[PDB]
Amino acid sequence: GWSPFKYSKGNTVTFKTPDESSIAYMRFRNCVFTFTDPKGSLHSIDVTEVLNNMAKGFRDAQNPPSSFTLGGHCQAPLNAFSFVLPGVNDRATVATADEAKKWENCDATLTGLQRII
Amino acid sequence: GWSPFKYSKGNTVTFKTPDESSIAYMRFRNCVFTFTDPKGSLHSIDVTEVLNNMAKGFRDAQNPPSSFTLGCQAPLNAFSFVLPGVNDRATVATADEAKKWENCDATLTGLQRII
Protein backbone atom coordinates (compact mmCIF):
# COMPACT_ATOMS: atom_id res chain seq x y z
CA GLY A 1 0.00 0.00 0.00
CA TRP A 2 0.98 3.60 -0.72
CA SER A 3 2.23 5.72 2.22
CA PRO A 4 2.34 9.52 1.90
CA PHE A 5 5.37 11.44 3.03
CA LYS A 6 6.20 15.16 3.48
CA TYR A 7 9.60 16.86 3.86
CA SER A 8 10.33 20.55 4.41
CA LYS A 9 13.25 22.93 4.09
CA GLY A 10 16.20 21.74 6.13
CA ASN A 11 15.16 18.08 6.26
CA THR A 12 17.66 15.41 5.46
CA VAL A 13 15.47 13.48 3.02
CA THR A 14 15.99 9.74 3.54
CA PHE A 15 13.61 7.13 2.09
CA LYS A 16 13.54 3.83 3.95
CA THR A 17 11.85 0.48 3.51
CA PRO A 18 9.70 -0.45 6.54
CA ASP A 19 11.30 -3.91 7.02
CA GLU A 20 14.92 -3.25 5.93
CA SER A 21 14.29 -4.99 2.60
CA SER A 22 15.95 -3.65 -0.54
CA ILE A 23 15.46 -0.01 -1.53
CA ALA A 24 15.44 -1.07 -5.18
CA TYR A 25 11.81 -2.26 -4.82
CA MET A 26 10.67 1.12 -3.44
CA ARG A 27 8.32 2.94 -5.85
CA PHE A 28 6.87 6.46 -5.91
CA ARG A 29 3.69 8.13 -7.13
CA ASN A 30 2.48 11.74 -7.27
CA CYS A 31 5.67 13.34 -5.94
CA VAL A 32 5.71 17.15 -6.07
CA PHE A 33 8.62 19.45 -5.23
CA THR A 34 7.48 23.01 -4.44
CA PHE A 35 9.70 26.03 -3.74
CA THR A 36 9.74 29.82 -3.58
CA ASP A 37 12.18 32.06 -5.42
CA PRO A 38 13.81 35.28 -4.09
CA LYS A 39 10.87 37.35 -5.40
CA GLY A 40 8.48 35.17 -3.37
CA SER A 41 6.75 33.36 -6.26
CA LEU A 42 5.82 29.66 -6.12
CA HIS A 43 7.23 26.98 -8.40
CA SER A 44 6.24 23.30 -8.53
CA ILE A 45 7.48 20.27 -10.46
CA ASP A 46 6.59 16.58 -10.51
CA VAL A 47 9.67 14.64 -9.39
CA THR A 48 8.08 11.16 -9.23
CA GLU A 49 10.31 9.61 -11.90
CA VAL A 50 13.46 11.25 -10.48
CA LEU A 51 12.70 9.39 -7.26
CA ASN A 52 11.73 6.13 -8.99
CA ASN A 53 14.98 6.29 -10.96
CA MET A 54 16.94 6.84 -7.75
CA ALA A 55 15.55 3.66 -6.17
CA LYS A 56 16.08 1.70 -9.39
CA GLY A 57 19.70 2.84 -9.37
CA PHE A 58 20.29 0.27 -6.61
CA ARG A 59 19.14 -2.66 -8.79
CA ASP A 60 22.61 -4.16 -9.21
CA ALA A 61 23.75 -3.63 -5.62
CA GLN A 62 25.32 -6.77 -4.28
CA ASN A 63 24.83 -5.49 -0.73
CA PRO A 64 21.45 -3.82 -1.25
CA PRO A 65 20.72 -0.80 0.97
CA SER A 66 17.35 -0.34 2.66
CA SER A 67 17.36 3.43 2.19
CA PHE A 68 18.61 6.22 -0.02
CA THR A 69 19.21 9.86 0.91
CA LEU A 70 18.71 12.83 -1.47
CA GLY A 71 21.58 15.09 -0.48
CA GLY A 72 24.15 13.27 -2.64
CA HIS A 73 27.54 12.86 -0.89
CA CYS A 74 26.89 15.69 1.64
CA GLN A 75 23.23 14.64 2.33
CA ALA A 76 22.36 18.22 1.20
CA PRO A 77 19.25 19.32 3.12
CA LEU A 78 16.04 20.04 1.25
CA ASN A 79 16.17 23.52 -0.26
CA ALA A 80 15.07 25.36 -3.39
CA PHE A 81 17.75 23.52 -5.42
CA SER A 82 16.99 19.93 -4.38
CA PHE A 83 15.34 19.20 -7.74
CA VAL A 84 15.89 21.10 -10.98
CA LEU A 85 13.03 22.91 -12.67
CA PRO A 86 14.51 23.99 -16.04
CA GLY A 87 14.42 27.74 -16.50
CA VAL A 88 13.99 28.53 -12.79
CA ASN A 89 16.64 27.01 -10.52
CA ASP A 90 19.02 25.26 -12.94
CA ARG A 91 22.62 26.33 -12.96
CA ALA A 92 22.20 28.06 -16.32
CA THR A 93 19.62 30.34 -14.63
CA VAL A 94 21.45 30.54 -11.29
CA ALA A 95 25.12 30.34 -12.28
CA THR A 96 26.92 31.45 -9.10
CA ALA A 97 27.23 30.52 -5.44
CA ASP A 98 26.56 34.21 -4.78
CA GLU A 99 23.52 34.17 -7.05
CA ALA A 100 22.39 31.05 -5.19
CA LYS A 101 22.91 32.86 -1.86
CA LYS A 102 19.77 34.93 -2.51
CA TRP A 103 17.73 31.69 -2.37
CA GLU A 104 18.92 30.72 1.10
CA ASN A 105 15.68 31.51 2.96
CA CYS A 106 13.30 30.41 0.22
CA ASP A 107 10.86 27.73 1.33
CA ALA A 108 10.81 24.23 -0.17
CA THR A 109 8.63 21.15 0.36
CA LEU A 110 8.55 17.59 -1.01
CA THR A 111 5.33 15.57 -0.84
CA GLY A 112 4.34 12.28 -2.42
CA LEU A 113 3.53 8.62 -1.95
CA GLN A 114 5.89 5.64 -1.59
CA ARG A 115 5.47 1.86 -1.40
CA ILE A 116 7.36 -1.38 -1.98
CA ILE A 117 6.44 -4.00 -4.57
CA GLY B 1 -3.88 41.62 -21.63
CA TRP B 2 -2.84 37.98 -21.69
CA SER B 3 -3.62 35.97 -24.84
CA PRO B 4 -4.00 32.17 -24.78
CA PHE B 5 -2.16 29.96 -27.24
CA LYS B 6 -2.19 26.21 -27.93
CA TYR B 7 0.17 24.01 -29.96
CA SER B 8 -0.15 20.32 -30.79
CA LYS B 9 2.18 17.51 -31.86
CA GLY B 10 3.93 18.35 -35.11
CA ASN B 11 3.14 22.08 -35.05
CA THR B 12 5.92 24.51 -35.82
CA VAL B 13 5.86 26.65 -32.69
CA THR B 14 6.43 30.32 -33.56
CA PHE B 15 5.80 33.14 -31.09
CA LYS B 16 5.26 36.46 -32.89
CA THR B 17 4.49 39.98 -31.73
CA PRO B 18 1.33 41.46 -33.30
CA ASP B 19 2.85 44.81 -34.35
CA GLU B 20 6.20 43.52 -35.70
CA SER B 21 7.81 44.96 -32.54
CA SER B 22 10.71 43.29 -30.72
CA ILE B 23 10.08 39.77 -29.40
CA ALA B 24 12.22 40.65 -26.39
CA TYR B 25 9.07 42.20 -24.85
CA MET B 26 7.02 38.98 -25.06
CA ARG B 27 6.35 37.41 -21.67
CA PHE B 28 4.52 34.28 -20.64
CA ARG B 29 2.32 32.91 -17.87
CA ASN B 30 0.97 29.47 -16.92
CA CYS B 31 2.78 27.65 -19.72
CA VAL B 32 2.48 23.86 -19.41
CA PHE B 33 4.13 21.30 -21.66
CA THR B 34 2.26 17.97 -21.69
CA PHE B 35 3.34 14.75 -23.36
CA THR B 36 2.67 11.03 -23.31
CA ASP B 37 5.41 8.43 -22.93
CA PRO B 38 5.59 5.18 -24.95
CA LYS B 39 3.71 3.34 -22.16
CA GLY B 40 0.78 5.79 -22.43
CA SER B 41 1.33 7.68 -19.18
CA LEU B 42 0.73 11.44 -19.21
CA HIS B 43 3.47 13.87 -18.11
CA SER B 44 3.49 17.64 -17.66
CA ILE B 45 5.94 20.46 -16.84
CA ASP B 46 5.62 24.18 -16.22
CA VAL B 47 7.72 25.75 -19.01
CA THR B 48 6.72 29.39 -18.34
CA GLU B 49 10.22 30.57 -17.44
CA VAL B 50 11.95 28.56 -20.20
CA LEU B 51 9.85 30.57 -22.65
CA ASN B 52 10.40 33.86 -20.80
CA ASN B 53 14.12 33.19 -20.99
CA MET B 54 14.04 32.67 -24.75
CA ALA B 55 12.32 36.02 -25.25
CA LYS B 56 14.80 37.59 -22.80
CA GLY B 57 17.70 36.33 -24.91
CA PHE B 58 16.81 39.08 -27.40
CA ARG B 59 17.12 41.99 -24.95
CA ASP B 60 20.68 42.85 -25.97
CA ALA B 61 20.02 42.59 -29.73
CA GLN B 62 20.64 45.66 -31.89
CA ASN B 63 18.07 44.50 -34.48
CA PRO B 64 15.84 42.06 -32.59
CA PRO B 65 13.36 39.93 -34.55
CA SER B 66 9.61 40.05 -34.10
CA SER B 67 9.38 36.30 -33.46
CA PHE B 68 11.20 33.21 -32.28
CA THR B 69 10.60 29.55 -33.11
CA LEU B 70 11.10 26.47 -30.94
CA GLY B 71 13.95 24.84 -32.83
CA CYS B 72 16.70 23.49 -38.29
CA GLN B 73 13.41 24.11 -36.39
CA ALA B 74 11.84 20.93 -34.91
CA PRO B 75 8.01 20.61 -34.73
CA LEU B 76 6.49 20.09 -31.25
CA ASN B 77 7.28 16.60 -29.99
CA ALA B 78 7.69 14.78 -26.67
CA PHE B 79 11.26 16.14 -26.31
CA SER B 80 10.42 19.80 -27.01
CA PHE B 81 10.90 20.55 -23.29
CA VAL B 82 12.78 18.53 -20.66
CA LEU B 83 11.05 16.96 -17.65
CA PRO B 84 13.96 15.67 -15.55
CA GLY B 85 13.70 11.97 -14.88
CA VAL B 86 11.30 11.33 -17.77
CA ASN B 87 12.47 12.63 -21.16
CA ASP B 88 15.99 13.94 -20.42
CA ARG B 89 19.14 12.56 -22.00
CA ALA B 90 20.23 10.60 -18.93
CA THR B 91 16.91 8.72 -18.88
CA VAL B 92 16.43 8.22 -22.65
CA ALA B 93 20.07 7.57 -23.49
CA THR B 94 20.03 5.06 -26.36
CA ALA B 95 18.76 5.25 -29.93
CA ASP B 96 16.40 2.28 -29.65
CA GLU B 97 14.69 3.85 -26.63
CA ALA B 98 14.41 7.28 -28.28
CA LYS B 99 12.71 5.63 -31.27
CA LYS B 100 9.85 4.46 -29.03
CA TRP B 101 8.87 8.11 -28.40
CA GLU B 102 8.39 8.97 -32.10
CA ASN B 103 4.60 8.78 -32.04
CA CYS B 104 4.05 10.26 -28.60
CA ASP B 105 1.59 13.09 -28.16
CA ALA B 106 2.72 16.55 -27.16
CA THR B 107 0.81 19.73 -26.33
CA LEU B 108 1.92 23.23 -25.30
CA THR B 109 -0.55 25.65 -23.72
CA GLY B 110 -0.02 28.97 -22.00
CA LEU B 111 -0.68 32.69 -21.98
CA GLN B 112 1.41 35.39 -23.65
CA ARG B 113 1.60 39.18 -23.89
CA ILE B 114 3.84 42.13 -24.74
CA ILE B 115 5.04 44.01 -21.66
Side-chain angles (χ1 to χ4, degrees), chain B residues 11-72:
Chain B
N11 291 358
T12 284
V13 182
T14 293
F15 289 97
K16 178 227 325 182
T17 62
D19 40 12
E20 306 311 303
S21 61
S22 165
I23 189 74
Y25 290 99
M26 269 261 294
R27 293 290 177 283
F28 303 84
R29 207 241 290 261
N30 305 332
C31 299
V32 48
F33 175 58
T34 310
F35 61 100
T36 310
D37 66 22
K39 303 193 274 130
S41 301
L42 194 62
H43 304 270
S44 64
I45 331 171
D46 181 324
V47 301
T48 307
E49 286 329 296
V50 170
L51 291 175
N52 278 327
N53 289 338
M54 288 173 82
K56 281 186 194 169
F58 295 101
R59 286 171 301 183
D60 302 341
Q62 175 53 63
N63 289 124
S66 57
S67 75
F68 69 91
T69 294
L70 287 194
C72 301

Side-chain angles (χ1 to χ4, degrees), chain A residues 14-84:
Chain A
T14 298
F15 290 101
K16 209 184 72 215
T17 59
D19 44 13
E20 265 221 305
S21 45
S22 192
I23 195 64
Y25 307 135
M26 152 99 69
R27 297 289 186 270
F28 296 88
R29 206 184 64 129
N30 304 117
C31 299
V32 174
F33 177 59
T34 300
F35 57 101
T36 65
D37 63 31
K39 304 300 181 252
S41 309
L42 309 183
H43 307 269
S44 293
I45 174 163
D46 191 298
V47 302
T48 309
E49 287 317 297
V50 171
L51 297 171
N52 275 328
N53 288 348
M54 287 185 168
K56 303 197 196 124
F58 296 94
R59 259 176 309 207
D60 288 303
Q62 277 324 72
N63 209 313
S66 66
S67 63
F68 77 88
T69 298
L70 276 193
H73 65 276
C74 41
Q75 289 159 259
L78 194 77
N79 63 68
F81 294 110
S82 289
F83 301 86
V84 38

